[PDB]
Design a binder for these strands. Structure first.
Lengths: 227, 121, 366, 122, 121
RNA sequence: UCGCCCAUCAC
RNA sequence: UCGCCCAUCAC
RNA sequence: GCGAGCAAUGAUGAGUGAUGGGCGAACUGAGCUCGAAAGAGCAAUGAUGAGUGAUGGGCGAACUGAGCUCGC
């Protein structure tokens, strides 16, 4: 028992829940598919899927009031550290049947569970290779409109920047979820976020910064433009 | 002559890399031997790495040059594995040594990195 | 100059115009796995010979280790990942591949990602015979549950049973369409039926003889059709396993004693035939050289072992066990040669497990 | 039609019980190439299925995968001692994926058996 | 049923060859197990060889029939390796048994050889 | 001790 | 219903 | 401040948790073993420590059952 509505970003949806709260969602890429065992929502000739902010940094950042979202219908995007995606898979629903998604993963197992889902999610292509080394997948990718990184490996500043030399267009965008502990476990998170802010501004226009409290602690999200 | 000594080393800076090991030994953070070099060469922020010129088979350290080209780190070498072990402060040998914090050696690492980056070019 | 791609391999000039591109001559998922991890392939050997015969030499590639294999083999190779070939080819595939290029990226990319995990079962021909019986038992349960589904659903709409006799199409109708008064002309085309089949079925919408199911009677019949859908997915899981695992072949001696020691022992016997005929007592002493000579000619003590002394659990090992292990090794070696020579099946990790039990028992006894 | 559907629901429970017994006989005969000690220890078919779903590869056993499944300590004084000295061979971690998936498919058939008993009552 | 068999038989000849093992063992000269069978086979000296129908893996005895053509000696099979071991007096099993001298059993081993030469044809 | 991604399910 | 500590045997 | 509504034929408390599979925060980084003992052999091209399975003693552990709600 719910009411379905449009969001401030195209391809993104909202439900009014039985609890009397707003919750974020997408229209399911094909109807009847499951993707993270999730609460799927039937409507009057349509089907929707939740984007859970209690276990998703992308959803939690939208609830924390993220302003600049560059992913839109029909566009081309690269995701770095995708696995399959409680947090990530919703870019396929937002980009829809007319757009293109590359899912890159270093982690030697988890991408095997995205492999069956893409027998109907045919706007995604999954490729196994190290996101630190943008040469690892060179034969199965193109220039894109957007690049994303969300696992926050010790290399993550190089992951976004050097992929954005080979794979990002003029007037292109990007996003990164930064955590301090992967770069230094002793100095202040807001100080480590300055060292990343001054390296990220050594290549991009930095258009937004957000801290992920009161959901997830000592993690932040940045948004960028390539001119 | 082994395949990993890809630039000709002059009568300068080699002794300064030996000195950088000697003074990091009690004042910085440092690893010695090639497998411990390898993990501190992948992981975290290494500052400099040092190799011997007489490593045989050469193959055991032949990985260190391309591993430094993937990750933007400088490397240098010194004339003997037995002297490189003695510089680290062990009575055996060492094929390589890695600097994680320079301690006293920070101005030496800055001079070496500046001069080697314009030598190889 | 070179650019590295799924829809063949490509060559471009200093100004960023195409020179030539060539398509692959082995399975493209295996050709990409080599080229991505930096070893060069037969179709790129031909493209760089074409580029040499055109009169170019300055062979800049995208990848450093592909360029290493190229200049280690003898070519005039260098490396720049952002070179004008990749900067053209990956900016607009439409100029070079055709507009449906993303179908060719998709069909090989998902196959490479499904393939990037190595395989080493212990007795895999037996472990695939059980999947051939699983294919016989899977069609056997489908041909049982769909008989119950036919007989139960024909209470409500019997005009379908003789008209959709192929069992998956009947299951898809009962899963996706379900209740008989849902049936219209459009949902039958969304199910993939032809006009010749849609004149019928719709014929019966106004005049069926079936008796009524209510809204949550038809639900349990839909639950049965939704679980039988997963049995057809399980048939795909078995078909995709059989197409991968039933093409394997591996020699036994090559795994039990290691390739170089196996290949040596086969010649001290004169041949693999002799190693599959001879007794373990003789296989124990093959190539002992002058220790066997003085045991025969001079009447000395028999040698405890021949070339089997190079076995990696005898060569390093203390005296108390070296003889006991050599005897059991010669028996298990005679078995492995008999399997490779008479049978051509693989059991070598079982033969290892048994000799490993005997080595553990030798420690537990001595 | 519901008095005729009484008959179809009763026959469907015995037909579903027969295909579960069939696919678990296949699962027992196949997994006996990797860990055959389980077949006379666990006569309860759903515990044999839940083992092959949760463990997958026989070399990755511990107490938790037995104790949480509701095996007794009187069953944990077996299985674990067979880690290396089971009379079975070795299926690979890469090949056993299809047998893990077969076990998750068969656990859905116990849900089908339960969905049919929920309708036999009705 | 194994691969290595060359002709069909009932319990006929087979029960008589098992009976011959039960009297050659303590009136004549015999060996038991397949590597001792194979020594007495390769150096010719086995006058009759008996093999099991249930060897597992089957491949360990699969040489004995063609090697008994290569040297020109008669061969026969029996239905269980444990019962062949018990006929050879031992408490384990035997995949094969070899007769070196029939002892009292000469007319019986000559009947077995003469009737097996009706089948090796 | 402390985090990050992952399938499937709940109170 | 479940975990943790110490002492101890076989490989 | 005082009253009003509901309730043992059931008031209160909680948007939060479960089960399964990897990765990351720089594994230890030099000792060991034989010898009467100086000594000798092995070791940063990796000494040593960190296993799995089983046997024995000890230590500890967590739903309430009436409050909730309001007008001026």
């Amino acid at each position: 028992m719910v009411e379905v509505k449009k969001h401030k970003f195209p391809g993104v949806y909202v439900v009014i829940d039985d609890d009397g709260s707003e919750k974020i969602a997408t229209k399911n890429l094909v109807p009847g598919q499951r993707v993270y065992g999730e609460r799927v929502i039937k409507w009057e000739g349509e089907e929707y899927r939740i984007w859970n902010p209690h276990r998703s940094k992308l959803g939690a950042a939208i609830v924390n009031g993220l302003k600049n979202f560059p992913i839109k219908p029909g566009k081309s995007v690269l995701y770095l550290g995708i696995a399959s995606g409680t947090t990530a898979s919703h870019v396929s629903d937002i980009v829809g049947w007319e757009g293109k998604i590359y899912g890159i993963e270093f982690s030697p197992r988890v991408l095997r569970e995205l492999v069956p889902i893409v027998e109907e999610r045919r706007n995604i292509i999954p490729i196994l290779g190290d996101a630190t080394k943008p040469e690892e997948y060179r034969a199965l990718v193109t220039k894109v409109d957007v690049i994303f990184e969300d696992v926050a490996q010790p290399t993550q500043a190089k992951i976004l920047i050097d992929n954005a030399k080979a794979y990002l267009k003029r007037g292109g965008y990007g996003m990164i979820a930064v955590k301090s502990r992967s770069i230094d476990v002793t100095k202040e998170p807001e100080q480590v976020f300055k060292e990343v802010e001054r390296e990220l501004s050594e290549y991009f226009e930095v258009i937004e910064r957000l801290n992920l409290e009161p959901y997830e602690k000592d993690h932040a999200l940045f948004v960028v433009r390539k001119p | 002559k082994p395949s990993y000594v890809k630039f000709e080393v002059p009568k300068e800076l080699a002794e300064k890399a030996l000195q950088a090991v000697e003074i990091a030994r009690d004042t910085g953070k440092i690893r010695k031997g090639t497998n411990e070099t390898t993990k501190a060469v992948e992981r975290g922020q290494a500052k400099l790495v040092i190799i011997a010129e007489d490593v045989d088979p050469e193959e055991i350290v032949a990985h260190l040059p391309p591993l430094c080209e993937e990750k933007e780190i400088p490397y240098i070498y010194v004339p003997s594995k037995k002297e490189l072990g003695a510089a680290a402060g062990i009575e055996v040998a060492a094929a390589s040594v890695a600097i994680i914090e320079p301690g006293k050696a920070r101005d030496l690492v800055e001079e070496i990195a500046m001069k080697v980056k314009e030598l190889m070019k | 100059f070179i650019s590295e791609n799924v829809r063949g391999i490509y060559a471009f000039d200093e100004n960023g115009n195409l020179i030539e591109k060539r398509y692959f001559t082995d399975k493209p998922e295996k050709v990409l796995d080599q080229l991505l991890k930096g070893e060069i392939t037969k179709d790129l050997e031909e493209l760089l010979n074409s580029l040499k015969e055109k009169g170019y030499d300055e062979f800049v590639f995208e990848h450093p280790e592909l360029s290493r294999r190229a200049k280690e083999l003898g070519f005039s190779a260098t490396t720049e990942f952002p070179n004008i070939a990749g900067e053209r080819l990956r900016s607009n595939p439409e100029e070079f591949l055709g507009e449906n290029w993303f179908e060719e990226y998709y069909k090989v990319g998902v196959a490479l990602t499904r393939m990037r995990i190595q395989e080493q079962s212990g007795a895999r021909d037996k472990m695939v015979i059980q999947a051939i019986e699983a294919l016989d038992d899977v069609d056997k349960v489908i041909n049982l549950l769909v008989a119950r589904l036919r007989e139960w659903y024909s209470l409500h709409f019997p005009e379908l049973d003789e008209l959709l006799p192929k069992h998956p199409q009947y299951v898809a109708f009962v899963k996706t369409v379900g209740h008989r008064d849902n049936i219209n002309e459009e949902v039958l085309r969304e199910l993939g039926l032809s006009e010749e089949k849609i004149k019928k079925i719709l014929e019966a919408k106004e005049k069926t003889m079936g008796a009524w199911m209510d809204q949550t009677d038809i639900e349990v019949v839909r639950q049965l059709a939704e679980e039988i859908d997963r049995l057809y997915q399980l048939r795909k899981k078995l078909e995709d396993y059989i197409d991968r695992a039933m093409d394997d072949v591996a020699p036994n001696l090559k795994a039990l004693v290691g390739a170089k020691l196996a290949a040596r022992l086969i010649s001290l016997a004169g041949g693999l035939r002799e190693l599959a005929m001879m007794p373990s007592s003789t296989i124990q002493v093959l190539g002992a050289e002058k220790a066997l000579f003085r045991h025969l000619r001079t009447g000395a003590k028999p040698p405890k072992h021949g070339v089997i002394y190079q076995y990696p659990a005898i060569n390093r090992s203390p005296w108390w066990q070296r003889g006991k292990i050599a005897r059991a090794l010669a028996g298990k070696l005679a078995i492995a040669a008999r399997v490779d020579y008479f049978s051509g099946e693989y059991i070598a990790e079982e033969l290892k497990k048994e000799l490993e039990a005997r080595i553990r028992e030798i420690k537990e006894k001595y």
